[PDB]
Amino acid sequence: TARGTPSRFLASVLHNGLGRYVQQLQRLSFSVSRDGASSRGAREFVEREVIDFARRNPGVVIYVNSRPCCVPRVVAEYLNGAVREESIHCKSVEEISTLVQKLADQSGLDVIRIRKPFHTDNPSIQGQWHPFTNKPTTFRGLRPREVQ
Amino acid sequence: IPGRQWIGKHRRPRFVSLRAKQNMIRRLEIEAENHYWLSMPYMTREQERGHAAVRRREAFEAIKAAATSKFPPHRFIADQLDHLNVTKKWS
Amino acid sequence: GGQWRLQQGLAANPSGYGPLTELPDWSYADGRPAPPMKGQLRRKAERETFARRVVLLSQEMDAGLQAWQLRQQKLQEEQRKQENA
Amino acid sequence: SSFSRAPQQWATFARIWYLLDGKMQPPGKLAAMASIRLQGLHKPVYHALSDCGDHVVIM
Amino acid sequence: KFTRSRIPEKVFQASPEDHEKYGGDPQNPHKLHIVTRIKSTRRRPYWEKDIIKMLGLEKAHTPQVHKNIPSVNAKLKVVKHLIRIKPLKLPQGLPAEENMSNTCLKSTGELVVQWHLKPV
Amino acid sequence: GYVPKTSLSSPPWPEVVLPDPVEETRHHAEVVKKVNEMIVTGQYGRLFAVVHFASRQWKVTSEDLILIGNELDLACGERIRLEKVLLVGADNFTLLGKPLLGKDLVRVEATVIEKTESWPRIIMRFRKRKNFKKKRIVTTPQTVLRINSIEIAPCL
Amino acid sequence: LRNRVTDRYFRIQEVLKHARHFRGRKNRCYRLAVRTVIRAFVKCTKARYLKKKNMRTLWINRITAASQEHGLKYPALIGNLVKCQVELNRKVLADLAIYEPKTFKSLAALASRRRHEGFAAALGDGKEPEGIFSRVVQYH
Amino acid sequence: TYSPLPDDYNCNVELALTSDGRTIVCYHPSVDIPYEHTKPIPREEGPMIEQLSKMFFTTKHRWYPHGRYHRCRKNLNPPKDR
Numbered sequence: 008t009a010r011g012t013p014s015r016f017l018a019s020v021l022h023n024g025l026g027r028y029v030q031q032l033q034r035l036s037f038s039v040s041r042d043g044a045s046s047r048g049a050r051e052f053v054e055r056e057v058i059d060f061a062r063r064n065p066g067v068v069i070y071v072n073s074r075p076c077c078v079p080r081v082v083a084e085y086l087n088g089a090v091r092e093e094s095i096h097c098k099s100v101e102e103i104s105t106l107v108q109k110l111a112d113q114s115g116l117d118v119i120r121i122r123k124p125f126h127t128d129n130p131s132i133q134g135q136w137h138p139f140t141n142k143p144t145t146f147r148g149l150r151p152r153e154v155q
Numbered sequence: 156i157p158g159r160q161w162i163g164k165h166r167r168p169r170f171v172s173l174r175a176k177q178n179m180i181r182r183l184e185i186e187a188e189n190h191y192w193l194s195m196p197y198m199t200r201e202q203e204r205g206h207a208a209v210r211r212r213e214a215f216e217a218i219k220a221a222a223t224s225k226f227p228p229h230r231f232i233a234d235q236l237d238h239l240n241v242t243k244k245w246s
Numbered sequence: 247g248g249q250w251r252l253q254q255g256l257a258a259n260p261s262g263y264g265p266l267t268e269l270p271d272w273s274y275a276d277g278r279p280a281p282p283m284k285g286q287l288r289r290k291a292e293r294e295t296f297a298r299r300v301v302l303l304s305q306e307m308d309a310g311l312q313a314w315q316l317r318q319q320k321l322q323e324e325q326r327k328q329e330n331a
Numbered sequence: 332s333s334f335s336r337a338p339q340q341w342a343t344f345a346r347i348w349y350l351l352d353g354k355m356q357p358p359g360k361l362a363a364m365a366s367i368r369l370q371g372l373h374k375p376v377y378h379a380l381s382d383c384g385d386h387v388v389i390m
Numbered sequence: 391k392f393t394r395s396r397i398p399e400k401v402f403q404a405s406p407e408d409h410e411k412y413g414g415d416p417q418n419p420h421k422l423h424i425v426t427r428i429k430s431t432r433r434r435p436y437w438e439k440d441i442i443k444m445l446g447l448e449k450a451h452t453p454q455v456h457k458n459i460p461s462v463n464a465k466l467k468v469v470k471h472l473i474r475i476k477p478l479k480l481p482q483g484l485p486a487e488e489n490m491s492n493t494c495l496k497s498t499g500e501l502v503v504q505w506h507l508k509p510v
Numbered sequence: 511g512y513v514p515k516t517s518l519s520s521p522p523w524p525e526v527v528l529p530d531p532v533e534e535t536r537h538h539a540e541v542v543k544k545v546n547e548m549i550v551t552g553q554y555g556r557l558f559a560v561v562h563f564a565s566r567q568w569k570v571t572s573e574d575l576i577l578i579g580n581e582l583d584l585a586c587g588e589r590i591r592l593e594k595v596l597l598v599g600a601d602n603f604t605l606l607g608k609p610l611l612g613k614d615l616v617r618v619e620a621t622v623i624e625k626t627e628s629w630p631r632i633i634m635r636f637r638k639r640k641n642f643k644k645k646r647i648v649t650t651p652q653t654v655l656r657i658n659s660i661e662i663a664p665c666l
Numbered sequence: 667l668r669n670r671v672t673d674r675y676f677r678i679q680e681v682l683k684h685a686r687h688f689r690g691r692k693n694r695c696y697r698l699a700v701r702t703v704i705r706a707f708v709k710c711t712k713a714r715y716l717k718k719k720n721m722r723t724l725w726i727n728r729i730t731a732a733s734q735e736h737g738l739k740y741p742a743l744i745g746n747l748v749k750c751q752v753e754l755n756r757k758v759l760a761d762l763a764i765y766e767p768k769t770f771k772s773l774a775a776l777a778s779r780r781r782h783e784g785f786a787a788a789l790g791d792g793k794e795p796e797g798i799f800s801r802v803v804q805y806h
Numbered sequence: 807t808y809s810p811l812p813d814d815y816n817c818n819v820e821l822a823l824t825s826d827g828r829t830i831v832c833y834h835p836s837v838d839i840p841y842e843h844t845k846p847i848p849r850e851e852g853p854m855i856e857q858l859s860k861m862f863f864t865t866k867h868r869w870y871p872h873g874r875y876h877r878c879r880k881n882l883n884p885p886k887d888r
């Protein structure tokens with residue numbers, strides 16, 4: 008629940024869409040057991056789609072480590088230093104190509120609650136409301152019951 | 156109020172506002188328009204006799220052919236040999 | 247404020263029909279139009295089956311009328327060929 | 332517009348002293364005017380936590 | 391005891407004052423109603439709950455075209471307090487299949503058969 | 511029909527009289543020529559636009575983030591024309607549609623920066639004394655739209 | 667005992683981690699903490715209905731505040747912006763009250779001019795030409 | 807001469823339609839405050855809390871301290887926006 012969890016505001020990393028779009032994914036690190044039943048779907052991702060994924064995003068360098076693991080992992084590292092290690096244990100090929108394209112779409116910010124759905128840094132153009140908007144001025148600025 | 160306000164012999168009095176009246180007078184006007192649109196049938200009972208009997212019979216014969224066509228599904232060598240794949244490895 | 251909308255023949259909910267929720271929300275900046283919304287495809291599906299069911303009922307009203315006037319004209323001639331011999 | 336971020340915040344949440352002469356006025360038409368201002372319900376920057384009530388002076 | 395209600399026949403005969411108040415014509419009546427549920431079938435008897443599913447009226451404010459034949463009408467009299475009946479007018483003709491997709495039932499009761507989303 | 515001036519003889523509101531509609535359509539086109547010529551020379555500063563995107567109205571300026579709560583089926587970095595803009599204000603003028611503005615008047619642009627999922631949102635039901643307790647963790651897919659440019663054109 | 671439960675520390679800690687910020691003994695002892703975590707999780711989903719409601723009455727209260735600086739009332743503004751076919755919702759109208767108040771002085775002017783065009787139209791009931799801001803843009 | 811609002815305080819609202827009727831145009835230039843509407847520049851725990859309620863027009867209850875449980879619950883790195 009939102010009082011038990013932290014929060015943050017809506018933000019991009021380095022104004023990600025203004026000048027150019029920079030893909031925020033930096034690395035992907037797969038660990039797939041060759042003789043191992045849990046990595047049987049992830050072995051086919053390395054077989055089929057890890058060449059095809061590595062040509063849709065050239066700015067992400069991919070590692071396939073292939074050691075004796077019991078639970079295969081993908082360690083997605085982002086440009087701002089956040090590390091998402093998600094577990095692809097006993098997933099199909101289809102559930103990983105959605106898993107890995109989701110890590111290549113998101114920014115490296117926390118998946119804690121976002122406070123507002125909008126973030127303007129210059130939110131007012133006609134001047135923010137202060138109490139003296141929509142009030143009339145009087146002659147010589149006299150406050151009430153001011154004689155001179 | 157002596158016991159359980161809205162039940163019993165000595166109930167709590169409830170009164171009608173204009174709001175609850177204009178909610179009720181406006182339901183009555185919607186109602187009375189339906190008395191007028193139900194007042195003029197296009198055919199009579201003699202003209203619509205059997206006028207949808209060819210489609211009504213055909214609709215049930217698709218409900219009947221839906222119900223008499225239950226069976227266990229076909230069972231393949233595909234789903235059985237595909238469990239041998241759980242020990243697929245690399246060389 | 248929505249009963250003034252019904253007097254003009256607009257929908258009482260402005261998220262009903264009309265240019266606010268039936269126009270496409272976005273287009274590409276290459277100019278090419280978007281693939282359709284999932285709510286507009288569903289709204290066009292319930293509107294084809296309502297126009298499918300208008301025609302089906304409006305044909306069966308005028309197929310049972312023209313079947314009835316044949317049966318009275320069949321049954322006049324069944325009398326007109328029976329006031330004889 | 333174009334203030335620095337601290338004096339503009341002092342502009343929006345400053346509190347205003349209202350005079351409200353209540354001679355021959357009913358004390359609940361006086362009350363329903365001051366109670367809007369003491370809550371700050373006449374500011375579009377109203378929020379219950381924001382503490383946006385103003386000073387009312389009823390003579 | 392609370393039973394079903396017979397609505398007598400001095401109710402569904404329309405006096406000539408009524409054809410001015412509503413837009414109907416006795417000579418050449420309409421072919422189709424648009425029935426729309428507007429009031430819940432909860433706290434209503436089970437025979438009124440059955441007729442509401444029979445007519446295709448499970449969702450409120452969902453319009454439904456029906457024939458103006460005297461048998462469909464007899465089902466409409468039992469649940470006339472839960473519905474709003476209004477005649478399906480067609481300003482253009484009934485939509486042939488070339489115009490079957492770009493139709494739109496307006497709220498006035500009528501079914502326009504070309505529905506662009508451009509002003510006039 | 512003359513009533514002497516008592517308290518209830520008059521209404522409490524002042525009898526506001528609306529102007530002559532041939533003086534007023536002439537004064538209207540006198541206004542629109544000013545607001546057209548404030549656009550032709552570029553007298554505006556930055557513009558806010560009020561856009562009916564996904565299901566709701568965002569009030570939107572250049573260079574700001576907009577969090578959508580549904581997946582938009584776009585590659586990240588793809589540029590979008592947001593149609594359906596219904597108010598375009600500047601410092602000195604506004605143009606509001608009826609309901610929407612012309613497509614050849616204002617062009618709002620937006621870029622897909624990121625496509626996240628929401629934080630895990632708990633759905634938990636409980637009824638006392640009934641052994642009824644169900645718990646469900648849902649996340650929604652979300653995109654974030656960076657609005658790049660609100661442009662305007664002299665078509666009034 | 668053939669097989670007993672070894673994973674029970676990790677089942678306690680799924681419920682105790684959600685209760686860590688509570689008061690008293692409902693953060694430590696699991697039997698009290700499970701009844702408060704449940705009640706906290708029930709309140710969290712029933713507050714998705716009251717976040718939406720409490721935002722709208724806050725928008726309505728901020729619009730009532732700003733349309734009274736310009737003399738109108740809330741119903742005279744909101745109902746009359748509909749008759750000008752201006753389909754701005756309450757969230758945007760509260761944003762124009764605070765962040766762009768020259769436009770809220772324009773929308774309170776549009777709503778009031780349409781309001782005067784409705785008094786001046788419905789006095790001479792019958793055929794009279796509509797006001798400038800009373801024409802509907804019909805769509806077909 | 808008709809004014810939909812008394813254009814005296816905020817801006818001079820000019821309303822107009824286009825010749826289509828499909829956009830409502832407003833021109834609202836900002837209002838300068840006149841020079842004549844302006845003035846020139848003029849050039850124990852107990853008694854302490856009573857003297858702070860008088861200064862800021864609060865009650866006494868926001869000046870008493872809070873215990874430790876509320877002090878170390880407070881976020882010290884709050885999410886800054888804008």
Ligand SMILES: [Mg+2]
Nearest residue numbers: 157158159160
């Ligand atoms: Mg009692």
